[PDB]
Amino acid sequence: VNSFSGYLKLTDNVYIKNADIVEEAKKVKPTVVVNAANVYLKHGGGVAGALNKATNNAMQVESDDYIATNGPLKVGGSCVLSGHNLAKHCLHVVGPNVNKGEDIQLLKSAYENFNQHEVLLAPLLSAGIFGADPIHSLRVCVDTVRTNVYLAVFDKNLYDKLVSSFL
Numbered sequence: 001v002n003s004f005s006g007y008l009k010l011t012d013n014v015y016i017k018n019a020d021i022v023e024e025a026k027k028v029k030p031t032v033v034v035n036a037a038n039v040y041l042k043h044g045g046g047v048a049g050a051l052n053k054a055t056n057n058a059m060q061v062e063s064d065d066y067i068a069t070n071g072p073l074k075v076g077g078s079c080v081l082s083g084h085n086l087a088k089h090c091l092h093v094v095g096p097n098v099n100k101g102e103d104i105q106l107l108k109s110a111y112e113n114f115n116q117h118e119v120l121l122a123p124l125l126s127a128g129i130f131g132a133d134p135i136h137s138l139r140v141c142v143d144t145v146r147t148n149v150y151l152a153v154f155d156k157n158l159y160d161k162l163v164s165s166f167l
């Protein structure tokens with residue numbers, strides 16, 4: 001039993017809520033929060049910009065040191081860094097950005113990173129500015145992640161569409 005509240009169960013291991021992931025993280029303080037990162041860990045907008053803002057830019061400072069040491073992530077890859085005030089750990093995961101011509105098939109590889117963690121609070125990957133269809137992303141999530149994932153969907157209209165169209 002854990003501290004997540006008000007989620008709709010989609011499958012044995014996938015749950016979904018219309019919520020701001022930043023507010024969910026501040027309330028729950030989960031072991032792992034997922035960031036929807038780019039390969040440079042430049043946390044400008046969306047989930048990444050909002051999470052970083054809530055850490056008072058400490059996420060960006062840590063991330064710049066990580067990149068200076070290790071170079072960029074792969075599209076489809078991830079790294080584990082601190083969760084700062086929001087969680088024990090942040091799993092920075094890079095979904096493909098279809099607006100940059102990146103292969104949508106890498107979305108499955110991105111979600112595979114979640115399987116290294118027993119429980120995660122996460123957004124839909126490759127949605128929003130990454131260009132991809134959120135309905136497809138939820139489907140890939142459900143068909144790929146085996147560990148327990150609590151999805152926070154920011155847009156109410158999208159949340160309603162995802163639930164009403166889920167199969």
Ligand SMILES: C[C@](CC(=O)O)(NC(=O)c1ncnc2[nH]ccc12)c1ccccc1
Nearest residue numbers: 020021036046047050127128129153154155
């Ligand atoms: C717009 C969308 C999808 C949606 O969930 O509608 N979501 C978010 O950007 C989001 N989700 C959850 N909590 C959040 N806090 C602040 C922002 C935010 C999204 C954009 C880019 C990459 C992944 C997902």
